[PDB]
Amino acid sequence: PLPKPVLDTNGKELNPNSSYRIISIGRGALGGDVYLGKSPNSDAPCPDGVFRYNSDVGPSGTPVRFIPLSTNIFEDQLLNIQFNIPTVKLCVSYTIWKVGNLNAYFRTMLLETGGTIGQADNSYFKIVKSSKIGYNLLSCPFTSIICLRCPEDQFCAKVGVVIQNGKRRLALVNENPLDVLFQEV
Amino acid sequence: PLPKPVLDTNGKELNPNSSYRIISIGRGALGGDVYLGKSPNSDAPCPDGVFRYNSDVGPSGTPVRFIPLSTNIFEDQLLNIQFNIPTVKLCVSYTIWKVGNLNAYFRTMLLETGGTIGQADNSYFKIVKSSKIGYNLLSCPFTSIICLRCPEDQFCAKVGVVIQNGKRRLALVNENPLDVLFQEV
Numbered sequence: 290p291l292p293k294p295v296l297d298t299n300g301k302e303l304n305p306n307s308s309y310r311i312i313s314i315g316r317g318a319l320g321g322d323v324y325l326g327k328s329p330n331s332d333a334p335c336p337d338g339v340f341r342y343n344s345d346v347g348p349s350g351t352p353v354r355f356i357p358l359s360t361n362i363f364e365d366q367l368l369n370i371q372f373n374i375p376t377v378k379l380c381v382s383y384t385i386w387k388v389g390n391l392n393a394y395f396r397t398m399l400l401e402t403g404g405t406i407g408q409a410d411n412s413y414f415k416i417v418k419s420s421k422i423g424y425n426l427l428s429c430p431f432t433s434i435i436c437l438r439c440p441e442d443q444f445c446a447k448v449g450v451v452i453q454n455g456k457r458r459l460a461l462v463n464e465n466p467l468d469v470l471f472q473e474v
Numbered sequence: 475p476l477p478k479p480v481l482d483t484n485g486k487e488l489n490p491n492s493s494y495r496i497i498s499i500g501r502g503a504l505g506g507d508v509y510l511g512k513s514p515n516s517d518a519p520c521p522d523g524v525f526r527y528n529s530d531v532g533p534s535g536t537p538v539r540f541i542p543l544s545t546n547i548f549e550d551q552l553l554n555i556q557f558n559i560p561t562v563k564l565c566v567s568y569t570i571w572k573v574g575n576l577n578a579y580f581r582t583m584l585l586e587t588g589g590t591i592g593q594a595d596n597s598y599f600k601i602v603k604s605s606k607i608g609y610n611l612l613s614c615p616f617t618s619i620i621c622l623r624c625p626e627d628q629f630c631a632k633v634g635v636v637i638q639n640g641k642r643r644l645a646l647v648n649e650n651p652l653d654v655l656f657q658e659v
């Protein structure tokens with residue numbers, strides 16, 4: 290059963306050598322690209338939160354790029370995500386996607402930057418097919434820990450949104466995964 | 475298939491109304507009861523770490539008690555653990571077992587106090603049968619998050635030991651779960 294590659298909004302497969310906006314299936318109010326923001330309650334000296342805009346009628350998202358364990362970007366395979374933007378050089382670290390510590394208010398972990406590439410921690414995601422339209426992101430935190438009788442001894446979860454100060458904040462959810470598309474820039 | 479009850483070192487089942495030492499199968503140097511200590515690098519104002527002693531030839535453990543979702547203490551069922559000791563009343567909270575945030579050095583989560591009873595977070599454990607001798611503790615953190623295709627959509631892990639400042643610190647492990655016995659006091 291051959292690994293299936295993830296495609297952009299043009300059919301053309303996903304390339305490590307290129308940058309993409311993670312854009313929303315949902316249209317208008319129901320849409321808004323993923324971007325890099327500052328968490329309302331973060332002590333980080335850089336923007337460290339992963340949000341989507343509240344409508345698609347405003348700014349484009351922040352270009353991300355993907356980093357497989359492989360050579361190519363496939364469905365259902367661990368990878369790193371990283372905002373692909375020039376930074377002031379305190380924040381030079383705060384571009385790699387990561388899943389945070391458990392947040393008691395939201396009872397889930399939230400997406401943030403400050404992650405690492407190549408390492409077995411909280412910085413691994415999966416692209417997969419939505420059960421509805423397009424693609425879902427997964428977060429597979431704790432790759433170093435045997436998740437008992439789980440697929441491949443690995444804990445993974447769907448990536449959705451919670452509302453944090455009236456902004457859409459990507460977080461691990463149980464229902465309504467964010468369905469997304471990748472759009473080269 | 476009827477729920478199996480967890481028994482102490484006397485055959486008598488485990489009772490919410492009683493206190494137990496979590497003691498080690500291993501003898502001598504290989505033994506040492508679970509106890510309540512202060513983490514070498516904790517900012518907590520109370521002792522907040524779960525350790526076992528380095529030999530069984532020293533002090534007895536700290537009595538814990540168990541708190542089922544049920545009425546009775548069974549194998550393979552979520553429960554809370556709490557040190558059962560009189561406290562100075564800052565620390566009155568710092569007796570309920572909990573699993574910490576991911577620790578990058580050890581690449582796992584560590585056992586600490588500061589947990590809560592009854593709530594869907596990081597304070598849930600399971601008693602089960604060791605694959606070798608006696609009982610293993612499990613930690614099922616993140617009960618609020620759908621662990622995809624995992625048993626009951628729940629991430630669980632074995633509880634073992636790492637060495638933190640030369641003391642034995644209970645933590646989520648992959649191999650060598652701590653095999654234990656419960657001994658009423």
Ligand SMILES: *[C@@H]1O[C@H](CO)[C@@H](O)[C@@H](O)[C@@H]1NC(C)=O
Nearest residue numbers: 302303304305306307360361
């Ligand atoms: C991108 O750049 C390197 C340069 O050698 C190529 O080998 C190529 O395999 C990499 N991947 C793609 C999709 O271009």
Ligand SMILES: *[C@@H]1O[C@H](CO)[C@@H](O)[C@@H](O)[C@@H]1NC(C)=O
Nearest residue numbers: 487488489490491492545546
């Ligand atoms: C302990 O105390 C209460 C008092 O009513 C009893 O109902 C009993 O069911 C509880 N459980 C055990 C094992 O004694």
